[PDB]
Ligand binder design. Sequence first.
Ligand SMILES: CCCCCC/C=C\CCCCCCCCCC(=O)O
Length: 133
Amino acid sequence: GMSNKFLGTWKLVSSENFDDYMKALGVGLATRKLGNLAKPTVIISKKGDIITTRTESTFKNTEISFKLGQEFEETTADNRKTKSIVTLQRGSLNQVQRWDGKETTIKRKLVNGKMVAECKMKGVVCTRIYEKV
Ligand SMILES: CCCCCC/C=C\CCCCCCCCCC(=O)O
């Protein structure tokens, strides 16, 4: 299952290409400006087979709870209503969001104790690095 090394509180220390990733999602300028300034905390916890991923920032908070491999309804930080699935692949916690015939993926993996999130849509790739708090 998911490594217990994912569990805990993570703080964003680096973000590369987030603006173009948000543009690809259809996020408007004012929102992108605040999104680029945000340095969120991400909290990953588990209760039984239910994993919760909570994101906290001054601008927006989000929270998803899911079982691996089972589709769930998600509301994203930019208020998309998606159908999402999280899978485990070679230690990587991989989230796919689908809405209106579109798709984006967020792959979270542990690298030397950091969590690295790779966000992909329409060939635009964003990398966000988090440190454990
Ligand atoms: C990080 C999301 C909350 C704070 C920023 C919200 C600003 C704009 C909403 C549009 C961004 C939606 C995509 C967020 C992807 C975050 C991936 C990650 O966990 O690093």
